[PDB]
Structure formats: C-alpha cells, structure tokens
Amino acid sequence: MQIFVKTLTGKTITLEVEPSDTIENVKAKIQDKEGIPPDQQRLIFAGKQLEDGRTLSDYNIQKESTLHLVLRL
C-alpha cells in the first residue's frame, strides 16, 4: 500500500508500506529518501504521536492515509 508524510515545509514524502510495518521501520524508510535519522523524527496521525514499536495497523493507517513529520531538536 501507499501512505503520505507531509512536512511543515512544503514536502510530501510518498512511502511504500505494509500495515505490518513498524513505526520504526517507517522512519527508516523516510531516512532512505530524506536522509533524516529515525530519532530525529516525530510522526503524527489522528492527533497522536506515533509510537516506535507499534505498527501502521495499530493506528488504522490504511490506503492513502496522511501523516505529518516534525523534526526533533
């Protein structure tokens, strides 16, 4: 499936994922494209910050779903 990660600075990363993929692995995928390290990444979906050891399916992230990315400092 495919989901989207919108930055606050006018970038929409398009990821190739599976419902079984861990949040941690999704943040690795973002690294593959954007070069941002996983520990410098906050992911948001439906008002929650996404927890590393949980999966997309745990949050009901389906086809087309859109998350947000905030950088840690």
Partner: protein, 60 residues
Amino acid sequence: QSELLCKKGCGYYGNPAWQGFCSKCWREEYHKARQKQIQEDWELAERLQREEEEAFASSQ
C-alpha cells in the same frame, strides 16, 4: 471508534491478518499458542520415548 478495535480491547486497532488483535496483543497470543505446542509436543515425545523403550526391551 469503529468495529476495527483490537479484540483484547486495549485501545489500539486490530489487524484482519492477525485475526482481530493488534501487534502487541497478537504477540502474546502467538506466544501463548506456541507454549501449548511445546507442551503437547513434549507429551508426544514422552509417548514415542516409552514406545521405543518398550519396543527395545521387546527384543532381548
């Protein structure tokens, strides 16, 4: 808030692939079912052991 909520009711969403459970709850279930196979397999092993020993002594 829909029908897709995890069957253990721990608040997270379940997965069709994991029969209704979330990632963490599915792990516990998986470990639970694995514990049972080891136990049953040990019991099988015992039977096969007793049988090999009986079949052996049924020689000399």
